Amino acid sequence: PKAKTHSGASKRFRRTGTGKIVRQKANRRHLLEHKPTKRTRRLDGRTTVSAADNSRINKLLNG
Amino acid sequence: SSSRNGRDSAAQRLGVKRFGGQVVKAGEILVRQRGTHFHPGVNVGRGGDDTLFALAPGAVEFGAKRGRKTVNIVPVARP
Amino acid sequence: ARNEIRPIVKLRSTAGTGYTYVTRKNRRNDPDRIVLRKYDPVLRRHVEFREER
RNA sequence: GGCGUCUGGGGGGAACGCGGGGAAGUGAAACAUCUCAGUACCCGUAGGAAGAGAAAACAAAAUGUGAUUCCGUGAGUAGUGG
RNA sequence: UUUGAAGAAUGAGCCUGCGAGUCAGGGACAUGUCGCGAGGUUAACCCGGGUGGGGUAGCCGCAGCGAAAGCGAGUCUGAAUAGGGCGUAUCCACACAAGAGUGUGUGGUGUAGUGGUGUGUUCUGGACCCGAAGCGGAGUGAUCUACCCAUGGCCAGGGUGAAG
RNA sequence: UCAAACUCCGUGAUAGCUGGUUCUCCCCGAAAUGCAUUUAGGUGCAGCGUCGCAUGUUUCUUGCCGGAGGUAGAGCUACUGG
RNA sequence: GGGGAUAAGCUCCGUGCGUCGAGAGGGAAACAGCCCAGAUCGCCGGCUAAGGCCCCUAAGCGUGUGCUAAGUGGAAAAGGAU
RNA sequence: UUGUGCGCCGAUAAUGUAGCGGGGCUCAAGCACACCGCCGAAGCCGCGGCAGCCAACGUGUUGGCUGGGUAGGGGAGCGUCC
RNA sequence: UCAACCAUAGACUCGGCGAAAUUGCACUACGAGUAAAGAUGCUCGUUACGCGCGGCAGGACGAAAAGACCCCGGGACCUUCA
RNA sequence: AGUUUAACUGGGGCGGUUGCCUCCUAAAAUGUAACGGAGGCGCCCAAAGGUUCCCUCAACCUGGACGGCAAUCAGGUGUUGAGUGUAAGUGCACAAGGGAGCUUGACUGCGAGACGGACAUGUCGAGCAGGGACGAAAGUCGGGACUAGUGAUCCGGCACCUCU
């Protein structure tokens, strides 16, 4: 049979044009009462995945 | 029958990071430090945590200004 | 941490004709709640908020 | 209810089917929700095949399709999910 | 197998024969090879004594950014051409700006993917081989032993001497 | 054979566990450390290995110049304490 | 360098220090980690290291000048002694 | 009375000498300082054969460097059956 | 104390039938020592003619049973205001 | 009836502990363990934040009504031995210590280049724009002298949006 995909890795990982892998960043949802805005501001956007986990993430996304 | 000690605090990686002579870009971090062990001089700025950084590119010179070790930046020669 | 009635209490700071809740955590054994306050809202500019919880 | 007469049924079968019941070890590096599986097994009835089947259906303003079933794709996608 | 075994750590009496990384699948990724080449290839199926011909439904590429509307070599955020993020195969040649690390506008050179197959790892399946204790479903078992029921039989011989 | 029999079936149950895993040569060639861990005998990533492509000496060694350190040592009417 | 009794073939850290692990051969009486030295195969060829030259054991009961009288050599303290 | 180099006593466990590896050694074969030679390894060299990386050249020759190896990665092959 | 004697079934000898668990090997000494820290197998020395029979039971870390005490992992069954 | 009931540990148990900050060990960069040695935190803050300006303490000597070892005062010596919101260190007299006036930057939209780096986390950040504070201006202000003061993801909740 086919190779089934990983839900989480599909919902928390996408791919751009040139094959990069992309994620979002952490400590953004709650407890913002005391987090300064610069700390709240480098956590926005997306970020390219590390090197070390690229392979693992390929194997999760594809099959 | 207990040793109530045992704790400790993980490091903070303090100290000099760009010594004498080197080439540094702008906004680069020369030293991380708690107090002003090293003070700013010329073309150098201070942080919040008493970190230092560069405001103008160039190269380092750890000199003193009235008994206090400073850090400076000098103009590189344009090619 | 929790939600106890802590000395450092209260929150919410709403705006007049400016809907951009700015937040701050403060005590409540002191008297005041009808003066001071200011900040920049959306589309608008430096104007005055309430501490309205 | 009793008596007489006439016709049926009764059980066996290797798998295949339809309706009903219906687990657990396993995986989750524990585990109860979940999964294994509505599988194994059990029941009642069949047939040479069965069941479903003629729209109280799809669709999207395209002037469209026109009973059902089984195969390929859509798709390991939209989604669902401690 | 161990840091370390000639080891007084395990295993083997000897011979002979048998005995453990396998298969599926247009599955995934990487890489060799072959056909085609900005195109590539068919599935079910039909016709075929055979391994062959057909079959455009589909899939992968050829433009992306953005949560989305949406826009488009630009787009998103934002009041902003003001910076940044992602993208615009890559290089090459000339310019203008700075050397806060190079950028921006032109010109040309022009983009290579896909389908078979082989190898390696891998996903789902018993998934390199052997090994439990023990969980569940349906049945077999009281001729042994535990207890009860129905019905029969057995307890030599000698002493003590209750009630009446 | 009983702190819950036996048999067939599920079932080739599962084991972070023990054992075992068969012909040859050529080249290179380790580790036993770090963070995390229901975790410490296991595993994930980094570390060290090789194969292929790319970048070409950027690695390493010696000499010379520039730089911060508060260790050995020594010192204390140069501070804190004896 | 810590813990320990400044004991352990103890335990825990450092180290462009080493070797063993994965590394044979020679010496150490025998002896994974010590010293030397890093094995492509052959030769009834030569020179050397560590170590050693009375016999066992191939090589010097070698040369020169002094000490040792204890079998020291070929275990050992506080302390004692013409 | 000082400092030295060798020495003495303190010295003391249970299968059998048994704290030179043994015989034995002071007519040193023991300690020290200098000197001379030598033996000694799979090290280096010497004569030959194979192999891998690179380089030079010519239609595969030569040369330099290299060749311990477990976990493991890669490469090239014998053999069995149909 | 304090053990002695006698008889039968065995045990020993002869004739016949004729197994067993166990087993890497083998023409399988002792000592002091070294070593994964208790050596038939190593070193250095001492002793010993080859092959058998009855007998003892110190060792071969003897045979048997993939420890039953401990620890880890998984189960089971039992309890309780989990 | 189905199942859970932790780990470390100089065997296990009993005890104690698990995260974060500071110091020594820690061996003159960074880093480095032990059931090694000493402490602390799970906060507070109309001001104890921002800005402009001004001043220097502690201690000792003396005088001095209650007043003494010390209270407030005056006069000298006093380079810094006090104090710094809270543990310790590094720093602070050039003051970051003490005091007074305005005051909300305890903002919004971003962010070159860098540190540290298994990974996710984490730390600073000049400079640009709107709109402001203070100040005569230069210029400083994106919380506190610095490092601790808190908890990923999922699932829900409140306000606003010209998204569906």
Side-chain angles (χ1 to χ4, degrees):
Chain A
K2 294 184 183 180
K4 280 184 177 179
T5 313
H6 198 265
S7 299
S10 172
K11 292 182 181 184
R12 279 96 141 227
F13 276 128
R14 289 195 244 125
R15 304 196 188 180
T16 68
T18 191
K20 301 288 178 68
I21 314 296
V22 169
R23 67 184 181 79
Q24 291 189 353
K25 289 185 276 190
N27 275 319
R28 188 66 187 272
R29 305 294 181 195
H30 66 95
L31 297 175
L32 300 172
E33 208 170 5
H34 72 278
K35 289 181 182 174
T37 298
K38 58 192 167 186
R39 183 177 174 182
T40 306
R41 181 171 67 238
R42 71 193 179 192
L43 300 168
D44 67 355
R46 274 81 64 197
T47 298
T48 303
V49 178
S50 66
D53 289 331
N54 185 7
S55 172
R56 185 177 287 277
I57 292 163
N58 283 108
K59 290 186 178 180
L60 294 174
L61 291 167
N62 299 124
Chain B
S1 65
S2 68
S3 68
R4 63 195 179 170
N5 288 314
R7 290 93 63 197
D8 201 1
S9 72
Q12 300 294 322
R13 274 79 186 183
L14 304 179
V16 174
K17 307 291 184 180
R18 293 290 187 275
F19 303 90
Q22 297 195 1
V23 166
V24 305
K25 296 184 185 177
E28 188 168 0
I29 289 163
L30 307 186
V31 314
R32 292 184 180 280
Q33 66 189 2
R34 302 299 86 181
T36 64
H37 188 80
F38 292 148
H39 292 86
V42 309
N43 293 325
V44 169
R46 183 175 171 191
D49 61 354
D50 287 326
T51 297
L52 299 180
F53 52 87
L55 300 179
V60 179
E61 180 65 24
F62 293 139
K65 182 67 171 68
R66 185 182 292 169
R68 290 175 178 176
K69 303 302 291 180
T70 55
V71 186
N72 303 329
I73 304 291
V74 305
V76 291
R78 192 257 184 95
Chain C
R2 311 210 47 235
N3 194 1
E4 299 87 0
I5 286 309
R6 62 180 295 175
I8 231 71
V9 297
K10 302 304 245 182
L11 309 184
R12 262 84 223 210
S13 273
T14 191
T17 197
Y19 262 118
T20 304
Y21 304 100
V22 168
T23 304
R24 181 177 181 170
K25 291 174 65 175
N26 193 29
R27 181 177 65 83
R28 59 176 182 183
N29 297 9
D30 179 293
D32 177 299
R33 251 321 305 281
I34 33 184
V35 297
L36 293 88
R37 317 197 198 49
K38 270 207 123 162
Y39 275 145
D40 289 336
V42 167
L43 266 49
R44 169 81 200 93
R45 310 288 162 248
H46 267 292
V47 297
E48 66 187 1
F49 296 2
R50 286 180 61 75
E51 296 179 353
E52 190 68 29
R53 66 184 182 277

